[PDB]
Design a protein around this nucleic acid. Structure first.
Ligand SMILES: [K+]
Ligand SMILES: [K+]
Ligand SMILES: [Mn+2]
Ligand SMILES: [Mn+2]
Length: 134
RNA sequence: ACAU
DNA sequence: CGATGT
């Protein structure tokens, strides 16, 4: 129904899919950029969305913030809930970096706790997520 | 089909 | 038009 304005919104950007992947997190209300990940040479859209949520969890926990996270990715939301990123991306030397990050994000989820609500951004009703790259 |  | 996902 109503946007929860006191929240963090994340989004992925890519050049190709698979391709160069980056992500960022922003204050939903103000658009202030709170974090941005250095581009990763090869990854998928869903790996990036997953990393963005987990980074959001770690960012909010470090700051003792109870804000929710918005993501528009049904896939990544599920992967975080499951603590398992079920990506189809081949493992090779060019994908080693993204896979290490994904593996390490899963490991963090399996060794930490959080109450942070992870919410679906309802693009059909509210327009583009505030962290959108465009 | 839905979400990217 | 292609690809990533549930
Ligand atoms: K995007
Ligand atoms: K499809
Ligand atoms: Mn997105
Ligand atoms: Mn986007």
């Amino acid at each position: 129904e109503e946007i929860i304005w006191e929240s963090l919104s994340v989004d992925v950007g890519s050049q190709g899919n698979p391709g160069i992947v980056e992500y960022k997190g922003v204050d939903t209300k103000t658009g202030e950029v709170l974090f941005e990940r250095e581009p990763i040479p090869i990854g998928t859209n869903n790996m990036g969305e997953f990393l963005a949520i987990v980074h959001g969890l770690r960012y909010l926990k470090e700051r003792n913030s109870r804000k929710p996270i918005y993501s528009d990715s049904q896939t990544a939301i599920k992967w975080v809930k499951d603590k398992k990123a079920k990506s189809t991306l081949v493992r090779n030397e060019e994908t080693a970096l993204i896979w290490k990050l994904v593996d390490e994000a899963e490991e963090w989820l399996n060794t930490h706790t959080y109450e942070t609500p992870i919410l679906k951004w309802q693009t059909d009703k509210w327009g583009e997520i505030k962290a959108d790259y465009g």
